[PDB]
Design a protein around this ligand. Structure first.
Ligand SMILES: O=C(O)[C@@]1(O)C[C@@H](O)[C@@H](O)[C@@H]([C@H](O)CO)O1
Length: 305
């Protein structure tokens, strides 16, 4: 009997992360495990997947530092505006010994292994307003903008730190919120802007680049522990191979889609990034998030970039 591996994500079927797991991870483990993905948060709500793995109702998810920070506030360090520099930097950080205690905490306290880090992409402010209606140059320009952000404290804080007035909303609700004007904008990376067709209901992207964002491939520790050494090696290899494939494809999308978006009439332009970075840094000073970061870890992350 093969082990069933149920995976739940709010991501679509066509998202590069989903594709990588389905086309690279799934066939590699198929000899002993059957991958069973659920997209669009049909099975488990966004931000409830970790709990579902811990409670034996799910085996895998595409988790985030923000989701983990709900349980272990120190994970907020990996979800902090302007800290990660690139996809390559994320990999260096995840593989550095600094990550060891973070990984151990999740295993010991949630019964979940973080197998791999995946690249999600550069988050930017995507607004319904045209550039002429609202030009984003400094954080002051986002005053009073109702910016959707995902529903966790660290996510809301990031939206606030940009200068906007964040509102929490599940990923699957964004399109309709933009269509009806219940929010002014959202911040998913360009491949998602296209995949989810947010460009049909917005007019600009201000390239704030405020979070070079990532996910983790989360995997039940109970399942892992029941696998043979050979099977564990295959699962780890399959997860890393999927992350690597997805990363390359996501980066390619990120490069090519600017022109596609502009062809759809989107205005895509950079603000004053020095001004944004400086402002966001000072927003974190004095915050609960800053106080949760273990000694020396931020400096270590910086040095790896
Ligand atoms: O809700 C989102 O905007 C977000 O980008 C948050 C990410 O952590 C991740 O959960 C993502 C989903 O995978 C959908 O792409 O949604």
């Amino acid at each position: 009997d093969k082990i069933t591996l149920r995976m739940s994500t709010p991501a679509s079927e066509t998202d590069q992360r989903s594709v990588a797991l389905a086309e690279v991870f799934a066939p590699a483990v198929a000899g002993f495990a059957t991958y069973q993905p659920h997209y669009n948060a049909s099975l488990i709500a966004q931000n409830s997947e970790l709990e579902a793995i811990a409670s034996g109702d799910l085996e895998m998810s595409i988790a985030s530092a923000q989701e983990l920070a709900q349980f272990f506030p120190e994970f907020s360090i990996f979800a902090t505006g302007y800290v990660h520099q690139s996809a390559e930097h994320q990999v260096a950080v995840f593989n550095d010994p600094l990550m060891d205690p973070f990984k151990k905490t999740v295993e010991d306290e949630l019964g979940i292994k973080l197998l791999s880090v995946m690249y999600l992409g550069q988050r930017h402010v995507n607004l319904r307003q045209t550039k002429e209606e609202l030009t984003v140059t400094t954080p002051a320009d986002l005053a009073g903008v109702n910016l959707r952000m995902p529903g966790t404290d660290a996510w809301q804080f990031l939206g606030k730190a940009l200068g906007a007035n964040p509102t929490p909303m599940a990923f699957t609700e964004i399109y309709t919120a933009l269509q009806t004007g219940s929010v002014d904008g959202q911040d998913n990376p360009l491949p998602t802007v296209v995949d989810a067709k947010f460009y049909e209901v917005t007019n600009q992207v201000a390239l704030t680049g405020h979070l070079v964002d990532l996910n983790y491939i989360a995997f039940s520790k109970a399942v892992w522990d029941g696998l043979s050494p050979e099977q564990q090696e295959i699962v780890q290899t399959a997860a890393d191979a999927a992350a690597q494939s997805g990363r390359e494809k996501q980066l390619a999308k990120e490069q090519e889609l600017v022109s596609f978006l502009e062809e759809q009439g989107m205005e895509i332009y950079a603000p004053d990034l020095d001004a944004f970075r400086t402002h966001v840094q000072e927003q974190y000073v004095g915050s609960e998030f800053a106080a949760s970061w273990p000694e020396g870890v931020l400096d270590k992350i910086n040095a790896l970039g």
